[model samples]
Each structure stands twice: as C-alpha cells, then as structure tokens.
Target chain A: MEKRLDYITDLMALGPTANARTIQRRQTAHRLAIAEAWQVKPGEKILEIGCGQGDLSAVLADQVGSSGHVTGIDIASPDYGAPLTLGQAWNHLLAGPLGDRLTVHFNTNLSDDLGPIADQHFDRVVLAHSLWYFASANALALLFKNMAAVCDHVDVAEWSMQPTALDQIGHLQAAMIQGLLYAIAPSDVANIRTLITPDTLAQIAHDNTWTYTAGTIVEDPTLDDAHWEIATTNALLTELKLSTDLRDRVKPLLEAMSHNGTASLATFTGRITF
Target chain B: MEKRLDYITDLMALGPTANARTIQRRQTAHRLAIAEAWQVKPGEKILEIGCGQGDLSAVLADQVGSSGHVTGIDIASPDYGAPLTLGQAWNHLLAGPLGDRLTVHFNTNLSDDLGPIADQHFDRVVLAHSLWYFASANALALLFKNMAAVCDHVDVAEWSMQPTALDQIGHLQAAMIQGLLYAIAPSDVANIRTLITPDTLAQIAHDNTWTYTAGTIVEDPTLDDAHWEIATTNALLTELKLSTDLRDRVKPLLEAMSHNGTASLATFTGRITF
Candidate 1:
C-alpha cells in the first residue's frame, strides 16, 4: 500500500505543461467538459474521497467560493516531499491559500464511521481512483454505502482503455498490477478480482442502496500513469520483497513507461448521486 | 479559438481567490517543472510564450531570482496577462533565475527577427505549451529551428490526446475536434489527423535538426483542477454561444474526469547553440 502511494506520487510528477498551443486548446476544451459535469453552483459543499494531498480540495473550495466548503479525505497522505500522514494533505493546503476552504481527514480506522457526515449534509461527494482498491469486499461495500447515504451527487472515474490500441506504453506494468493479488495472496485473488469490476460496483450500489444518477468512463493521459504507477508497483514489490528477478524485470519496464504522456486503463464506470 | 480562451478565462474566475489549491497546484507544478527543466540555475536568461496574464510570468520573475531575467510574450495584452504577439516560441529568453537571478522582457513579435535576443544570450528558451497552434507545420519547424539556434534547451508540451481511460470525457472530444475540422475546413483536415502522435512529433524533431534530449512528463494532483475543469468548461461554452448540448452531455463526465482530481502534461526536448 505504501509502495502504491509512492507510485501514484511519482506518476504525477513528470507530466503536463503548456507547450503546444493545440495541447492547451484540447486541455481547455476538456476543462469545459469537467465544469459541465459538476453542475457546480457558486455555493455548494463538496467532499472528495481519496483527496490525495488536498490538491482538488482547494479547487473545489474555489468553485464553491467563500460561502461553500470542500472536505477532502484520503486513506493516506502521499509523499509531497513532506511528512507522510493523513492530515498532511490539509497541512499542505494550510501552507497555501486554500487553508480556509480545505479540510483533509485521514481514516486509519477501517470502520469508516460516517457518524460525523450527517445525512444529506453534502451537496456532492467524490470518489476518485480509490474505488478500485477495496481492502475487503464488505468494508468497501460499507464505505460506498455510507458515502451514498450522505451526498446529493457523486463523481467517479473509470478507466476508458481506448488508447491501448493506439499505443501500449505502460502495458507491462499495467499487466503486473492485474497480477499483484494472484502473486501475493492467491487465496484472496477472487476477492481482489471482484473488487475492481463494474459488477462489483453494481453490487455495491445495490447492496448499499446506492444508485447512479449519471456517470462516465474516460481516459487519463498520464501515459500509464507514468512513474506513479512505477513507484506504486515497485513499492509493492519492495515491501513484499517479491522475487528480485521479477522486481528487476519490472524496474526497467517501469522506467521505460512513457512520461511525456500516458494512456490510462479505461475506467469501467463513474457516477453522480442525485 | 477566441471562444476557447474566453472559456478558459471564465473557468479560472469561478474561484475568486487566486490561491485556489488546484490552480496553485497546476501553476506550481507547471512552474517547477519548467524551472527545473530549463535547468534553471541561480541566474540565467529565459523566455515564456503565452505568458497568460503574467500570473505565471510574475512567479517566474521571482523564480529567476534577482540575478536572472525572463521576457514574457503573448498576443494578448499584459492586462489580459501576457506580452501578446511576441516571440512565437523562439527568441524568447532574456535572463532567467539561476537561483538569485532577475530581469524579464515582455516582447510582442513572431520570432521573425533575433535583434531582440543577443548572441549566446540565453541559457534556455521555453514554449510553455504555446507553439504548436497558430503556426503551421512549416512555421512550427521554423520556430523550433530558431529556438535551437537561440537557446541551450527548448522545452515544449505537445499533448494532443487526453490519456484518461476512466471517462468518455475525451472520447467525444477527439471525435468532435475532427468533426469540427472536417465540417469547417475539410482540406485542413489532414493537419488535424496527426494532432498528437509520436511520428508527428518525430517529424518536428527531425526537421528542427536539434538533438532530442530527455523528455519527461509529470502530473500534479490539483484536486481543484477537477472542479476547475468543470467550472471553466461551462464558462467557455456559455461565452461561445454554442449549442451547449455537448456541455450538457459531458458536464458530469467532465466534473468527474479527475474523479475529484487533476492531471497535467509536460515535455522537454531541445539543445543550445554553442
């Protein structure tokens, strides 16, 4: 898990800059796409699940303006060249202008108690890339259930998988993540396998009484999420001390993964709660 | 194009406080990478294209420190936030931060002349994602050739596709862009075909005759970028007076594009003249 965090952290560090005008144009075009989806009003409350380091928390705060608030929660704080902890995301926000609008919470207890999140208290709740990793099927179910209970709207991202035909930049490492569970805990492989599929999400939605108002599955151009994926996969290898030969095989492939850009695993689904 | 710019501008305004976490993350990530990519030392000469409203330029100004110099250029006025219509990606550096460096030039030219940039004058020249459009393939070639002749390193971000497979967010977009081009300028469609491909990039790289150095891509989790993407996209459409149909279809998808986070694109490939 720590290695996974490191992977995501490094993955984002080596991409996107405004160099080509068309790139900016496409970026601008997509920027509009995102705005339309949120239906964000000038004053709205937002809760982002897996708000790594509070980056989006600050943006949501800005969208909601002074009257609104943004609460970001992540299972762990990524290494932002700072202390690795849950609240560190908020601390990072505090160092910046979003100190007032952003509040980050860490959940060490697997309980994921939502007692503090009053029913219908939040206008919107976001579940980012975090949904794929369900430590336990039951726990993951409870988590989504609680989230669906409180928020009016939910935003989700599912891997689009369209660009692989065009280019298979990080195909090898991506292939490895799919194999991680099998290599580590073969007995739990079935459980892990069920965690990521749309069917699982569908089951959770039903079991927890959650319903998708509207949703989408799109592509993230991180070029196989670049080094972040690398950092993550490698960390798992290092911590588990997986076969060094395998680890070594994985290392060069990770390094070779595209950084200038990425083609992501197509998301299965995402939704907005009404 | 004007509509797009307006859209981006409108989106940026959703958050009144410039300190928006997502915006800062984006701006910081962009700045840091460019700063580091330019091999920014304590003092050196640098240039920025599309120096939007000077927000980044001002920061870059401080970044180059007191001993360096930076000249910013853009077609829009500084009031609009950049030295508009200046160097079009070449002849754009004028002393940047080599640590405790300072000095900035805001030019308004198209790199047709090098009188403004002296011989062996700058350490690095950067396009900051501003060179691909407005200039044709030949023009882009000329621009980069000029860039190689003038500076030590020329960094450009030529992102064409959104690599997120989580949402159909960019799915409709790539199609729509081609659609727009085909409908409006059928003949110009060929240029649109390879908007972002390695071969296209290689073509530019080949013609520029500059040695391709290391290319690095990075991403920063500006949680705010997700929200900003949502807000700004709407602003653009509203300003465009378009059907607003696309916005309607993609709003939620876009808002959830980051699934509550943001992504970026960056690339650096160039060399300096001796």
Candidate 2:
C-alpha cells in the first residue's frame, strides 16, 4: 500500500507541468464527451469513483446544477501546500460556487467495498480512468456488480492503447526496485495504467450482466511529437522512481524509444448498462 | 417476411460490379479478422447463419478440417446461372476439397426458429454480416438469445457506420419501385445495410446477457476517388433498380455526395460470450 502512495505522487507531480498539463486537459475534454453521451441532466444524482481532486466531479456538479448531488471517492486525497486531507479538499471546494452540491470521501476502498453508500442509488455511476486500479479482472467484475447494484448505467473512461516499450521499461525498472526491496512480483506494482483495456473490459462487463459500448472519448489531435516526448519522459521518470545514477543511465534509451514514435497515448470511453 | 427477401435481393445485386465488389470484399476480410480473434481451431463444430454463397463458410470449412463440421443456413439460396440452387451449390462445393465436411441448408428462418438444429450445440455460432435482416432489434435480440442456448460463443461481423443521405436515397429509390406508389416510408423499408450499427449491437448484447466487443474489421485504404465513384454509382444503381432515365437523373446527385466523401463504407467485427 505504501508503494501505491509513491505511484500516486508521481502522477500528481506530472499534473503541474506545462506540457503535462496540456495533455491532462484532454481528460476534461473526455469527461465532457461522456457527459454529452450520458445526456446528463440537472437534478440527477451521480456517483463518481476515482474522482481525483474533484476535476470531473466539479464538471458534473456544474451540469447537474444545485438541485443534484455528486458523491466523489478516491483511494487517497490530494495534497496542496498544507496538510492534504479529504476535509481540506472539501473545504476548498465548498468555498467555490459548485461546492455546495458536492461531497468527498477519501481513503475509500472501491474494489471490495462501497462503505457507507452501499444502500444508495444513483442515476449515473462513473469511473474515469479509475477502473484499472483493481488488483485483477475478478476485482473489476466485483466492482461492476456493486456499481450495478446502485445504478442502472455505468460509464468508464480509460486509455485504450497497449503499453509501449517506453511504458514497459519504466515499469519494469520500477518493479525491479520494489521487488529487490519488498519481494513483490514485477507485475504487482499497482501501475493503474496497465489495469483495464477495452477488450478485457468488454469481457468483464459481460460476465457481470452489463452491456458495453466503446467509442473515442478524446482524440487530442494537437499533441505533436515534442509534446508527446515531454509527456512520455515525465511519465517514465515517475514510473521508474530511479536513483540519480540509474536515471542517468535510462534517459538515453527512453529518449530513443520516444523518438521512434511508439510511446504516444490514445484513450477510449466505454458505457455499460444493465 | 416477403419484405425481407426484397431487401436481401437489393443487396445481392450490388455484389457484382467494380465498386460494389471492392466494398463487398471488405466484408470477407472483416470475417477473416474475427475468425483470427476467435482463434477458431480445427475439429470445432461450427454453425453459420446466413452463409450466402459460402464465401466465409468455405474458409471455415477449410479451417475446421475433415474432422469437423460446418453447417450453413440461409433464408434463400443464390442462383449462379443455369437455374442456380442450393443443391447445385452444394454439389459444386462437395466436388471440391471441403465437400464432405460441409452441409448447406436453404429456405431457413433464422429470426424465431433454428429448425431441426435447436437441440444441437455448436462450439462456435457465427453470423457474417447477416444478423441485421430481422424486422426489429427485438427480433435480433431474440435471435441472439436463441444462439446462446446453442453455443457458448457467438461472433458477428457487420457494418459499423450509419447510412448517409447518399445510401438512404439510393435504397429509398429501390424500395420506392417495390412500394404501392411510394406509400411506405423510404427509411422504413428494410435496408439491412442501414441497420445494426456497432452501438446498437452492443445494446442488444447487453440486453441478452452476452459480453460484447466491437473493433475494425476491414479498412479498404487503397480505395481511390475514381473507385469510390464507380462503387457509389453501382450501389446507387442496384439500390435504385433504376431505369435508364432515372439513372441519369440520380447519378449526378450521388456523384456529388460521393465526391464530397459522404458515401464511403466502414465496417466492424464484434464477438459475444454467453
């Protein structure tokens, strides 16, 4: 679980950079795409799992208006300058215009439990790129069943492409460091990026008695070679968690792979219904 | 239904010419792609609905080998000159290498009935661009439920795109000639090509407790501007059942739509599990 903290920190660091920020903005565009497909209306109750820092939850709040409510859950909360707690996050949100209708829960276990909300029902249940955090496909199926128990419609937004050599090498090195110290399997490092693919999601959805449709969510046509290189490099550095000496050694090989046009990102959105 | 026969004939006649032939070839390529995904193995008992003239069925026959069986069903058989019939088609196929392993059935109703084969189970049941002829999605769902009873795995290959103004006008004109002085709605006429998009299939699969995934089947990248014109024109002709005068009247409009790239074809393959 401590290793999961390191992984989350790496992603948060990338969120602040110029190029990384540009790439991350596509996630908002993707959420908007889903909102349109869902025909999300005001006064609809919504539950958003894996709502990091309330990015999309904020958007859903705006769309659902003050009449509706949005419950956001994350495995861990984000840290601003001070002590980063779910209460502090909620405090900052409540200070804003859309905060009144929003509620936040951190340190929530989404895979095995729904916690206090087990008896709740929602018009829409969504997980944005959060489906992959589960330990296995069986865990995902269990999560889907739980989601269906609460909502008739479930939507997930996730990266559709396979991990490229750039992705594999970074994770491979990261896993190696963890294994030599912690004796964990190389694939057990909780790299959420590797968790769920469109193919696997379809199978899992079917097993859980959900119908699934996948389509392009955000094709960020503007992310060119330079933008991708910076994004991939930032991602690789975070994933590898390398020592200074090891970082020096890996940068050249990572540079070569990035130049070869194999590390680009592509994402897809899928909707499932009972 | 007799209306279904008229719809099927309109599509069948589009198969012979330069453009229509090019487009039709993609359907076979798409089916082959699905077969590869399904990892169809030798000695696997296979059932194919709407086998048509056996383009894909022939490939399945070769793949399953002499130890397996390929049972094909069609609403009605095709004519290949000299009073062409299913018996003649079967005789020709059996004289070839795959004959003993293949069985052909014509005048078969696939929507609400599976005839004598209901009690039998198959390792794989497939429909190659043939699931759309049913009267409604209700009928298609009924067929999928029946398929699940007989096979654990079901595969379907169908067009992924929506029919454009170009397709509708051509098909509408074709239906017009068959109507009681244009009393039927042009869109209401059952053009299977316009029905059964990837989204619709996903919804139907979900309704039937089947897991579904859809992906690109055949992408004809080599199609040039001239090829599209010929193909679009040929499709228009068959769809119109046009006389010499009407052909001249309609050609220019379809040509304009074709040139603007609205009349292009795109197809997809999908797989489902019970």
Candidate 3:
C-alpha cells in the first residue's frame, strides 16, 4: 500500500531532468509559443487542465500577472512525499512573485462536471500537452462545449503522433516492455492510440461550431540523458500502467534509447473560439 | 530519470499489509494444498515465478525445510525502501529460519530464456497468481513447454474473475479510475482482459501436450480493513499504473467498496504433468 503511493509520488517528482540551460531554453520557447498563440492578457482569468507538476501553470501565472487569476487542476498532485506542495511550485519555481494569484486544484476531473470551477468564468481554458487523454474526438468536443459555457476561448497543446526517430525509439521501448511483461496485448496497444491528430482536432472544432487555428511549437531537439530517462519512463508508465517490477526490467533498454541523442517531439496547438 | 527510478523503488516497497494472523493462515493453507497436491518431499527443489513480495516463497521454504531448496524469481524486487529484502522476507517472515533454504532472483523474465535457472533442475515449478500475464494461449503454452524442460511438475493458482461481490466492487473502482483518466478506450478495457480461464488453460494444456489437473482451493474469506486497503490499492496500482495523485483521488471510493465487506476472490490451482 505504502509502496504504491510512494511510486506515484516518485513519478510526480519527475520534473524536467535536463540541464538548467537546456530546460530554460525549452521552457522559454514553450512559453513564447503559448503567449503568442493564446495572447493571454493581464487581469484575465486562465484555467489549465491536466496541469502536471504545474510547470506551465507557473508560466501562465506570471503571464497573467497579479491582477488576474490562474487556476491549475490535474488528476495527480505534485510530489507529496517529497513535500513539494502546489503552493511551493509557484514559490520556488516562479520565485514567489505570483503568491495567491495561482490556485491549484488537485484531483480534478474536467470530463466529469467541473464542479465549483465551472461556476467561475475564464477568459481562456488550456489543456496543454494533455488533450490526447480524451477517449475520442466526440469526447474532446464535449469537453470543449463544456468549456464554452464558461470561457470565451479554449486552447489545446498536443504532441504529433507522426512517426519520427524519437517516436520510433519510443515504440521500440514499448515493445521491449511488452515483451518482458506480456501484459499488454496487441489489441490493447491499438486501443491506446486514438486518432487525436491536428486534422481530427480540426474536425471536432468544426462539428462543435468553434473557430479553430492550429500551429506548430518547435523546441530544440537535443536532450540530456536524464531528460530522456524521465520522459520515456513516465510516458511508458502512464500509457501502459505496467507493474513497477516489469517496468524496471525494461528500464535499461529505455536508458539506451535515451542516450541515443535523439530529437525532441513535435507539438501542435489549437486555439478555438467558442 | 533518478526520480522515475526512485518512484519505481517506492512502488516496489508496497508489501502485503494484511494482519499477521490472516496472512499466515492463508499462506499456511496455500502451502498445505501445494504440498499435498504435488506430494513435495523434505529434500525437493522448487522454483517459483512471479513470487511477489516473497510471502509464498517463505512458506514454501519452511515446507521444503533446510534439506530442501526454494528459489523465487520476480519481475520486481522485494520492498527495499521498506527494508523488506528477500532475505528478510524469508528470515523474519519465516521466524528467523529457512534463510539457508530460500533464494530470490529479482528482475527475471520467464517468457525469455530461463538462463542459469534452467541449467539446474527442479522437482516443481510454481506460477502462483501470475499465469494470466501471458498475452495469448500460444504464449502460455510456450511458457509451459519451457517449464517442462527442467521441472517434473508445474502448478498455477489464479483468482476466478466471476462476478463476486468483491469483483463487482473492484470493477466499479477500475471504472472510476478509467472515467477520471479518460485514457483507456473501451476497446482497451476489453483487450486488457486476457482469456486465462480454467477452460482456456485446459485448451492450452491440450495444445501443449501436457496432462493438466485443475481444482479449486477455498481459503477463508475473513479480511480486515487494512487488508482490504492493501489488497485493493496494490492490485489497482499494479494493473493500471496510475499516478499517486490520481490514485489518491479515487482512494475514498475504493475505501467505500472495501467497507462493503465482500468475499475474497476464489482461487483455482492447476498441476501439470511435465
């Protein structure tokens, strides 16, 4: 029981493990892309879903300034075992300037009723790097409609699933883990890959009667070994839900992939007007 | 990457939290059933795969005694963070005895070649509560054929997935997590369930040309709240690989199910003439 919780807590602590310079460069570019795409203004409310570890939340908080409110919600919490609280995420990472301006709601499910959050209005709602979790295009559209009731605009950032060197290596690593555990069947793997490409998102947007604009956000391809390890392991764990023991068996193979000096993932964002 | 590894380490630390009396009673009954079923002698050699946390391994060690040998292999290690080493699992759990008789190998893959373990022979090989990991009937048959190369007899124990009160609640809990994450598609849920029923195993055995005998082992169903919490959480985490944050959100719901006071799962064992 304790071990299960500890594993989850450990996963929460897996923030960007790249060197500070590389992290700063990537984060700076990501923030610029979000800023240009969403055009978040000062003294405007912002909402974020699946705000893992609050990296983008802190950036959004800073962008919105003290006059505006930034609310970040996720199904998972920050590293509770590490004593890294949501408040501390802003304080340490954002250098304590945002203070009470940032409100983090942990253990939230937007697909279900947004609860108290839905009551509040937002200038923009963001699902950054997390839109792929939706089971279908229709499910994602339903979420957008729900957001439409409370916000004027909604933005979603997602990785392109197009085959790349990095994606190929990731697929190989997944295969290695599957070979080791024999838990995930081929059909299960097929089900995991939903059609959530830009074309699909555009279709959902059209069906929902929302105006949509899409663009790519390119970050530097080079990554440190630690970055690869954290990203690859977390992605595999999240996607497959394999046992920690089975995951450990395949860690060496993933590590080898991480050290292969691969490029970064290509991401696309869609800003929709409801 | 260290954090990801650390998370896995913490997950491995989740040991069985059932009261000592209940665990001992269950394990005692299990060992007794195996001993009588296979007619294991005091000087016999036994191999155990997927021997999680080594609880059953210790029991087997005591049954085989100092004159016999017991080797336990698992994909994951014993809870090292919780100070539950494989040696400690044998020495402490078995009352400071059976240390010399028990050996544990971590991070083993039976689906792969048996390596050195296959070089030696075993009187019996046990796959308790773990045969279902095989992706298909053919894969399971291949594993059985491999086991036949070095063991006289092979035994398997599995939880019956019939809709018991306990299983219903577990299904509900899983549904809740899936609903919250919105990650697993409907097809995924279907694919996750492998065809590993007794009937399926019988077919596989026939195909593999091994004589198979199957029977039910009915253990006492009495369990405390702590026992329920440990069992339900560990099972869900292992199967889903959910983050601690997400798991914590659903913990209350699982607790409600635990308090429903359902029966423990019914287990059936199969002994194969190798």
- Please give the lDDT score at residue A125 for candidate 3: 89
Q: Model 3: residues >4 Å from true position, as ranges?
A: A1-25, A78-87, A91-95, A135-137, A163-195, A223-261, B1-274
Chain B, per-candidate TM-score: 0.59, 0.66, 0.66
What DockQ do you compute for every candidate structure?
A: 0.01, 0.01, 0.01
What candidate 1 keeps of the native contacts, as a fraction, is 0.00
TM-score computed on alpha carbons, candidate 1: 0.39
Determine the TM-score of chain B of model 1.
0.59
Q: Higher-TM-score candidate among 1 and 2?
A: 2
| Residue A10 lDDT in candidate 3 | 22
TM-score of chain A of each: 0.63, 0.68, 0.67
What digit string (tens of lDDT, one per residue) describes model 2 on residues A168-261? 2222222222222111122333343233566666777677777788855444333342344345444655565445534432332333233223
Candidate 2 DockQ, CA atoms:
0.01
lDDT of 2 by residue, B1-274 (tens): 1222222222322333566655545544544555665567889899998887765676677678788889998777455333345556566676677778888777777674666585788998888767545555566778778878788878777533322222322222222122211111123333342245566667777787778876545443332422433454446445644345334323333432332232323345777888
lDDT tens digits by residue: candidate 1, A27-113: 333322343455567678777776665434554565677788887765553433232343443565565654676666665323455
Model 2: runs farther than 4 Å from truth? A1-27, A78-90, A162-184, A187-190, A221-256, A260-264, B1-274
Per residue, candidate 3 scores C-alpha lDDT tens digits across B1-274 of 2342232222222356655544445555554555555556788789988776665666666568679988887766554435356545544543444567777777777768887596889988987756645544566677778888888778887654332333233432332233223222222322122325566667666876777798665443442322453464446545665554444333333443443334454556778785
Scored against the native two-chain complex, candidate 3 gets a DockQ of: 0.01
Which pairs clash (backbone N, Cα, C closer than 3 Å) in model 2? B19-B231, B94-B99
Worst 10 residues of 1 chain B by lDDT: B88-97
The better-scoring model by lDDT among 1 and 3 is 3
